[PDB]
Amino acid sequence: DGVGSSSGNWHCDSQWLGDRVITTSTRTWALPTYNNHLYKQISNSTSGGSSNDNAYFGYSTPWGYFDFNRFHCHFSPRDWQRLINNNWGFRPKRLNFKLFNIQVKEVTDNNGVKTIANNLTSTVQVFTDSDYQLPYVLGSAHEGCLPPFPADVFMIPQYGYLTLNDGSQAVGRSSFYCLEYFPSQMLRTGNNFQFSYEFENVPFHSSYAHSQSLDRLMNPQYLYYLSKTINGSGQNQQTLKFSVAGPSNMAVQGRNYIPGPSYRQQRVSTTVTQNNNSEFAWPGASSWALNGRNSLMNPGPAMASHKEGEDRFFPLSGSLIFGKQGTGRDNVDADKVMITNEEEIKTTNPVATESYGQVATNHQSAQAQAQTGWVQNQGILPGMVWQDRDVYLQGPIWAKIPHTDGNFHPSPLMGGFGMKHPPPQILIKNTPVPADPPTAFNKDKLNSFITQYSTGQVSVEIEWELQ
Amino acid sequence: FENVPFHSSYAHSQSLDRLMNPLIDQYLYYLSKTINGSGQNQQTLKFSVAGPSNMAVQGRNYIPGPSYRQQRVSTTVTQNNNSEFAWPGASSWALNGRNSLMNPGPAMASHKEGEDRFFPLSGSLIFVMITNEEEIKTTNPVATESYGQVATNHQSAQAQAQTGWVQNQGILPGMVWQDRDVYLQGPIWAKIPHTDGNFHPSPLMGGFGMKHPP
Amino acid sequence: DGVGSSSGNWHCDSQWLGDRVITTSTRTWALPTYNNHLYKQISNSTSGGSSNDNAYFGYSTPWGYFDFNRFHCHFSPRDWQRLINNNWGFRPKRLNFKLFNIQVKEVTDNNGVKTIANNLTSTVQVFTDSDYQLPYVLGSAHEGCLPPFPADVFMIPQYGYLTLNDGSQAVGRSSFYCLEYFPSQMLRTGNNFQFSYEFENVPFHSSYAHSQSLDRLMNPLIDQYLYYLSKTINGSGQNQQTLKFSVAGPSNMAVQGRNYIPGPSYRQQRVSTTVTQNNNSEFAWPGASSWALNGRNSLMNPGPAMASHKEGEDRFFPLSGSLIFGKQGTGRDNVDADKVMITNEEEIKTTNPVATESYGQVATNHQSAQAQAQTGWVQNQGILPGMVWQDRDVYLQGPIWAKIPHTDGNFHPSPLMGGFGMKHPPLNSFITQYSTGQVSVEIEWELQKENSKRWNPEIQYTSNYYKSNNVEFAVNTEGVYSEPRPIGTRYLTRNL
Amino acid sequence: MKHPPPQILIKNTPVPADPPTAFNKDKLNSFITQYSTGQVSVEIEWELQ
Amino acid sequence: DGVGSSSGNWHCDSQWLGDRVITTSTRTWALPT
Amino acid sequence: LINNNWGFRPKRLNFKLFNIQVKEVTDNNGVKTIANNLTSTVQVFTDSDYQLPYVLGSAHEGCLPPFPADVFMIPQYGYLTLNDGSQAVGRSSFYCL
Amino acid sequence: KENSKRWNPEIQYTSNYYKSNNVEFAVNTEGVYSEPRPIGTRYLTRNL
Amino acid sequence: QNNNSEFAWPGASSWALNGRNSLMNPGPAMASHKEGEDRFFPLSGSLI
Amino acid sequence: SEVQLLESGGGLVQPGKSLRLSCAASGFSFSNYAMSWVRQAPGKGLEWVSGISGSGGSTNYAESVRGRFTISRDNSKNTLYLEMNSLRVEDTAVYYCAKGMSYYDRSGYFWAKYHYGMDVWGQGITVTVSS
Amino acid sequence: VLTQPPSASGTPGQRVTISCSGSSSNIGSNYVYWYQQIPGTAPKLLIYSNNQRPSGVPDRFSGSKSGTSASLAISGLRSEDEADYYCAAWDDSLSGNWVFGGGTKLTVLG
């Protein structure tokens, strides 16, 4: 509207009505100029590379982007506490996004003693990608999200995207997207921006632990099992005997459903003396290989962290590990981080550090004993039932389902809601305002720009449905 | 009753691998010979039309369902190993550290054609009366047999090709399978546990899986 | 209607309107008499049946069948180029079939001279199975389909089916089907036949290659809040066990947590086009990846959709994981590798593991003070929650549809050789006699337009600029039409 | 003329001879020797100056 | 119209409909004296 | 365009000029500061009667950049008229825009 | 639009597929957007 | 293979106007080279 | 190693006789690079004999081999051919097939300066000219 | 022709320079390429377009051209870096030829 009038208020409350919850978050953002308003090629060699599995090729953009991918953005500890105790499930419904009170500052630095002043005629470009035509980077559990604490001011992250590579080079199939080539809205300090988004139908996250265990669903049968293959010690004692499956022996009863899939993880103790004296962080880890590159299987299939009665053992990459406030970047100790575990899901799921079971590896005969082998990984089988991974106050909310010919149980492995059309990416940058031209025409693009940045407010509203 | 598929009470008259027309060739090719003959440095690549003469090598659009191998037991006792292998030699699944017998488990053919004496250890419903699932062999691998073979390495001038037996195989795109048959003494329905996800909820002892049963 | 009146016209053109393509193809056919008007039981022991894997039992019928199931029947090489470069996907919608200009000939051979004359009173029997009550042989990649070139005159293939067997013998559950037991329509030289079919809903085949890879979906500039166990020991020495954690970030991209994992894998043995690199042994069948059914071992050909080779390794091909097409005039048995065209699925590597590589590694034991952490290779991996994968590509030479077998269950029914899976797809003394006529099939295709915002130019399928003795996809001097290469549909790109 | 009188193309439809009784995928090279005859009348209206 | 109100938005794209193509190009310029 | 079409040609044209910003360069004692001048104007017109010399057909430099993120400098308008050597002639024309 | 009845496939302008330090018609590591080659308009064909 | 002399302006095709020679650049549309030739180009024939 | 070049037709030839060499190229678009033949005499440095343009329109030859040798390529068959006539003992060498690294097309022109640089070579075939 | 010293020597971890002298027609007006060949093997490209280098080549190999002379410098010399080096450039004179240098055999002492 105008410079002498405000374009929006401070909205920061959560309202509970019936089975529907509305959450309102409002923050103050600080956006700088990135790459001096240039698209730059970034690759393996720029960061020094030298690792095969780490080779990449892509582009860094002058544009920034807005992300609200964690619950603690939308949930205070109390509101999160009211959520998990009284409700079996929840899921988003609608998303409302506003951008207001845009400010832009110019930085004049002459022999130090820098000065900051309002630049009133500047604009701030913003657009949403609602056709999902740009790469979607918001499903990778990144930093730069709105801080959990409403009085904190955060720095808007820089947007970038990776495309195909062979080593540090680029194959001709690599794509280069220009974010300037998208129609966008330009906001001076008095203009405001908003849009609405509708969540597509997704199942409720199951915020509960099963009272019963998959094996013990019985009532303490008319089916029989083979109890004895021999009468006793001696020669030629082979025989077949059958006994009723009943309360006395509950392991051999016939069951309708079997536990879900498993991909074994290496087990690590919190007491280091019980661990092997070697470097097995990488060599002893579960990975998957794609185009000859090995990527760690983290978190991977949702499985119980440990067996009942064990607290000092955790899967090597099978869990989400959060850092404490003010945690160092490199080689921090174990008490500096928070290792989450998924004990609740053990009822339906095998332990990540245990084998799924055993199979017959041969045919028995008079000359051969029955042999078995351990099943380290087990794909889907008819009759499997399983639980997904839990969501945390610090964890991500949703992920984007890649666009492919096929997928199975699209729910993302880090947890949360998988969506073919997730909430769109919101891209933003400062409109470049160049310095004084040479006064004689030059065909070169202008490389001189006034040091400048913008700030303002962001309000995100999400409607939830409770079960 | 909530909507459930018809239980299919029939046996396929055709087998999964024989669906071809026996009189006409495929325009597809396969690798017939990797060497010219016996000797040194005889490596070569030869291709041949996949056709009625060799039906094993033809391309196919579908493959049999999953398998979890059960131990094989003969009804003639002297043929069995002279030891107690009931529990120790049986396929199981461990949950929270507790081992449970994998009974019946994945629907699979009880035995190969022409082999009635044998029966899967835990793979049959025993009422004694031991049931079999001969009908499902057309699309279902045998319970006591491996699913197939898989290359375990890369061949080279130095290394000859090696394979290994797949004892159990999870779902793959292209699999088709039959469920377990229902019996006069067998169950009708089974409640589907309330979970984040499941696959082919039909229960493994037979019958109609239902989220809201009686 | 009459002998001197034409019952149809020649329709053979494709129309592109909006997001739809209608292709009409007309060919000239000739139908002989098969099995001398008889049904004949066939089996393996007639050919000697020296192998159990090759055992079969069935029947052979006098009937023929029309098969248009290959793409090049309905598309010219130009129309196929126009399709693949401009579109992200396509799928069939409606089908129309016409049979007209029936001409029945008699051949009278007296002494050593034979004479051909029109027998006007004769009829031709034709019926289509819309209840799918007969064995369906059209989804087995067989020959006998309409020729790609319109001027070619082709022969109708003989129809036959297989049933249950034990060895060469039949079993009690084997079924016998008489095609005379179906109500059919009889046509003289003035009658014509037509029917119209409606395709059931199928997903668009994706004619594109991803521009991103499953592991590189991250933002390269920012760190991840999650941590990973970077170090387990201080350094060289004794009692140096320790646990350290680091931020997963742009520095190490292999260790980041990912929402999705690559598709399933069933490993293939790797063969190189350079023969000296292969082992000096007969490993075609012995070293093959197979699946056993009822005791018979069938080769896993092609099997699951997997990238044929690692990037930068063109020479290697999966042993039975790829579709192999013959060049024009290729011999039926023991031809060289230059007589066949080996297609590859290189474009799908972004979401799918390499066919000749392991899926990954797992932990095989529990690490302890007395035991090192051990791992093992996953040779085959079934479906896991969170997998994403691509199907097999379709080719100008490849098949179009396949019938989903009728079973209690299936997973991702799309056929493994490529194409659209569907539950309802499209007196012993006689006179020597045969028929001929015209057939016109009209299929309506739906398109999905390319919406990409990519700035730089796409890869396209283009014809070669240079001079050659023969124009590709044309006739030679002797008049033979040939297709030089197998053409995939994946050129344009999308984001992953 | 940019759009002159159109070309009129005509051929005899090939009538195959007797095919073999066993299937072969090769195109049919054996045809019945054939020709056709008939009448053609063209009528042009000419304008005079 | 106003000091703090933008006078136009950013339009760049190329929508192809039927037999026509509409191309839109937006840039930033600087004019010296 | 070039792969799918036998021909093309322009039909309509729309040109917008907006988001005007006037920066005044203040250089005091060798250091320079750039501030807004809010009351300054920028004159613009189009010649729709084709009265001025037409310089747009000589394939000159100074056009809009190919790449949307480039900021371009506007070229300076000048023209030419009749001459003999470096002299003018009585038929030469002068234009004041 | 192209109405052609040509049977064989036409020549098309394509991006070559091979590894390189850059992709054509994009920015390099310094932020400089270059156009490597001129692109003519004549690929499809007609009769004379 | 070129002549060892400076012929860029001397050997150039040009037209005269009011006593001033202007180079014929690009000029009338003509084929750059005969088919099968990739090493030759007209002196002022094509845009550069 | 995607790009692959093979040489065949090497052998022992008496002086005066002429033999033909062939190179089979794969892994790249053949007609878009200018191939060349480089020969290395035993215990001697590399020597460039001849190069051909991608279309095949223009060919160059070293003075020593000029008029006896002729280089041709079949773009349809992806083959580089070197026909040698009036061979002599001086020709005994290991001949290599080298692919021109620079990529060009019909829009541009062939430039012998830029397009003869060779990124990848071939194993080579020994050629012996002895009595 | 392009002139190169017949042999060059170095110690591991020590910089070594190989240089080729040329006429105006070749080194002076054309790009210079460097090929590394180990006997019994086809040559490998180290440096092309004067100072540029192909992927899969280590950072230590650096090449530069000044006037009619081009120098290839190797830093952090290794045992595997011992081979024969060939200097190449296009020659405008005498009908246009690609010229290779005489070759230089680098020996790693110690």
The DSSP code sequence of A381-401 is -TTEEE------SSSB-EEEP
Structure tokens at A431: 């409109």
Question: What is chain D's length?
Answer: 49
Distance from CA of I1 to the nearest CA of C (A): 6
Distance, CA of A228 to CA of A252 (rounded, Å): 13
Cα–Cα nearest to A30, from A128, A97, A101 = A101
The pair phi, psi for residue A425, each rounded to 5°, is -75, 140
- Across the interface, do C293 and B16 touch by the CB < 8 Å criterion? yes
Structure tokens at C393: 């590509």
F2 → closest Cβ in G13, G27, G33: G13
- Torsion, Cα I115 I120 I123 I125, to 10 degrees, reads 0
Is the CB of residue C83 less than 8 Å from the CB of residue C91?
no
Distance, CA of C257 to CA of C215 (rounded, Å): 10
C-alpha distance from residue C176 to each of B14, B113, C58, C195, C237 (Å): 11, 21, 8, 27, 77
R_g of chain C, CA atoms, integer Å? 28
Structure tokens at A263: 């991909």
Distance, CA of I124 to CA of I59 (rounded, Å): 21
Whether B and J touch (3+ CB pairs < 8 Å), yes or no: no
In Å, how far from its chain's centre is CA F12? 20
- Across the interface, do C28 and D19 touch by the CB < 8 Å criterion? no
- Across the interface, do I53 and H36 touch by the CB < 8 Å criterion? no
Distance, CA of C351 to CA of C371 (rounded, Å): 36
Beta bridge partners of C340: C326
Beta strands in I1-131 (DSSP E): 4-8, 12-13, 19-26, 36-40, 46-52, 59-61, 69-74, 79-84, 93-100, 118-120, 125-129
Distance, CA of B98 to CA of A67 (rounded, Å): 44
C321: Cα within 13 Å, side-chain hemisphere:
30
Distance from CA of A382 to the nearest CA of E (A): 47
Structure tokens at A277: 């004296």
Distance, CA of I37 to CA of A119 (rounded, Å): 66
Nearest chain G residue (CA) to F7 = G1
Distance from CA of F84 to the nearest CA of E (A): 31
- Across the interface, do I57 and H39 touch by the CB < 8 Å criterion? yes
Residues C15-27 as b/e (b if ≥16 CB within 10 A, e otherwise) read ebeeeebbbbbbb
Cα–Cα nearest to C160, from C272, C61, C234 = C61
Distance, CA of C218 to CA of C213 (rounded, Å): 10
Distance from CA of D26 to the nearest CA of B (A): 12
- Across the interface, do A381 and B199 touch by the CB < 8 Å criterion? yes
Distance, CA of G44 to CA of G47 (rounded, Å): 11
- Across the interface, do J103 and I46 touch by the CB < 8 Å criterion? yes
Q: Which helix (H) or strand (E) holds C77?
A: helix C77-86
I113 → closest Cβ in J86, J90, J99: J90
Distance, CA of C155 to CA of D25 (rounded, Å): 7
I128: Cα within 13 Å, side-chain hemisphere:
5
Whether the CA torsion I54, I57, I58, I63 is positive or negative: it is: positive
Any chains having at least 3 CB pairs less than 8 A from chain D are B, C
Degrees, nearest 5: CA angle C247-C250-C252: 70
Distance, CA of B207 to CA of B213 (rounded, Å): 12
CB atoms within 10 A of CB B42: 15
- Across the interface, do F71 and A110 touch by the CB < 8 Å criterion? no
Is the CB of residue C99 less than 8 Å from the CB of residue C126?
yes
- Across the interface, do F34 and A450 touch by the CB < 8 Å criterion? yes
Distance, CA of C219 to CA of C40 (rounded, Å): 66
Residue A288 amino acid letter: W
Nearest chain A residue (CA) to C224 = A142
Residues 1-48 of G with CB under 8 A from A: 15-31, 33
Distance, CA of A276 to CA of C365 (rounded, Å): 12
Distance, CA of A340 to CA of A327 (rounded, Å): 16
Distance from CA of C436 to the nearest CA of D (A): 7
Is the CB of residue J81 less than 8 Å from the CB of residue J108?
yes
Any chains having at least 3 CB pairs less than 8 A from chain B are A, C, D
Helix, strand or coil, per DSSP, at residue A73: helix
Distance from CA of F17 to the nearest CA of G (A): 25
Residues with Cβ within 8 Å of residue A143, at least 6 apart in sequence? A157, C222, C223, C224, C225
Chain H contact set for I54 (CB, 8 A): 38
For residue C86, with 0-12 CB atoms within 10 Å meaning exposed, 13-18 middle and 19 or more buried, which class applies? middle
Whether H and A touch (3+ CB pairs < 8 Å), yes or no: no
Cα–Cα nearest to A209, from A343, A354, A302, A80 = A343
Distance, CA of B43 to CA of A220 (rounded, Å): 66
Chain A contact set for C378 (CB, 8 A): 376-377
Resolution of the coordinates, Å: 2.8
- Across the interface, do C154 and D18 touch by the CB < 8 Å criterion? no
For residue A251, with 0-12 CB atoms within 10 Å meaning exposed, 13-18 middle and 19 or more buried, which class applies? middle
Distance, CA of C44 to CA of B112 (rounded, Å): 20
Nearest chain F residue (CA) to C456 = F67
Distance from CA of E10 to the nearest CA of F (A): 10
CB atoms within 10 A of CB C328: 11
Whether J and E touch (3+ CB pairs < 8 Å), yes or no: no
Is the CB of residue A373 less than 8 Å from the CB of residue A285?
no
Distance from CA of G32 to the nearest CA of A (A): 8
CB atoms within 10 A of CB I89: 11
Beta bridge partners of C388: A407, C262
Cα–Cα nearest to B98, from A318, A346, C367, A311 = A346
Chain A contact set for J55 (CB, 8 A): 167-169
B10: Cα within 13 Å, side-chain hemisphere:
8
Is the CB of residue B134 less than 8 Å from the CB of residue B111?
yes
Distance, CA of A251 to CA of A221 (rounded, Å): 13
The backbone region for C83, taken as left when phi is positive above 0, alpha when psi lies in -120 to 50, beta otherwise, is alpha
Is the CB of residue J36 less than 8 Å from the CB of residue J47?
no
A172 → closest Cβ in G18, G28, G31: G18
- Across the interface, do C466 and I76 touch by the CB < 8 Å criterion? yes
E30 → closest Cβ in F1, F8, F71: F71
Distance, CA of F10 to CA of D46 (rounded, Å): 41
C-alpha distance from residue C97 to each of B119, C155, C292, C444, J60 (Å): 52, 18, 40, 12, 70
- Which of C41, C299, C362, C403 is the mutation pick for testing B, counting most B CBs within 10 A? C299
Structure tokens at J11: 């110690």
C-alpha distance from residue I75 to each of B165, C54, I34, I51, I111 (Å): 47, 44, 11, 15, 19
Structure tokens at C383: 């479906």
Whether E and I touch (3+ CB pairs < 8 Å), yes or no: no
Distance, CA of C279 to CA of C470 (rounded, Å): 38
Whether H and E touch (3+ CB pairs < 8 Å), yes or no: no
Measured between its terminal Cα atoms, the distance across chain A in Å is 42
Distance, CA of C44 to CA of B48 (rounded, Å): 20
C465 → closest Cβ in I4, I27, I106: I106
Chain F contact set for C460 (CB, 8 A): 3
Whether A and G touch (3+ CB pairs < 8 Å), yes or no: yes
Distance, CA of C176 to CA of C58 (rounded, Å): 8
Is the CB of residue C393 less than 8 Å from the CB of residue A407?
no
Any chains having at least 3 CB pairs less than 8 A from chain J are A, I
- Across the interface, do A137 and C217 touch by the CB < 8 Å criterion? yes
- Across the interface, do F74 and E29 touch by the CB < 8 Å criterion? yes
Structure tokens at C299: 């080769």
- Across the interface, do G2 and F5 touch by the CB < 8 Å criterion? yes
Beta bridge partners of A187: A124
Cα–Cα nearest to J100, from I98, B79, A242, C29 = I98
Chain C contact set for I75 (CB, 8 A): 464, 466-468
Residues with Cβ within 8 Å of residue F28, at least 6 apart in sequence? none
For residue A141, with 0-12 CB atoms within 10 Å meaning exposed, 13-18 middle and 19 or more buried, which class applies? buried
Contact with chain E for residue F59, Cβ under 8 A: no
Is the CB of residue A73 less than 8 Å from the CB of residue A460?
yes
Chain I contact set for J2 (CB, 8 A): none
Distance, CA of B31 to CA of B46 (rounded, Å): 6
Residues with Cβ within 8 Å of residue D13, at least 6 apart in sequence? C28, C101
- Across the interface, do J56 and A168 touch by the CB < 8 Å criterion? no
Structure tokens at A241: 């005997």
Distance, CA of A271 to CA of C256 (rounded, Å): 25
Contact with chain F for residue C85, Cβ under 8 A: yes
Structure tokens at B141: 């691998």
Is the CB of residue A352 less than 8 Å from the CB of residue A260?
no
Nearest chain I residue (CA) to G13 = I107
Cα–Cα nearest to J109, from J14, J34, J20 = J14
Nearest chain C residue (CA) to F68 = C455
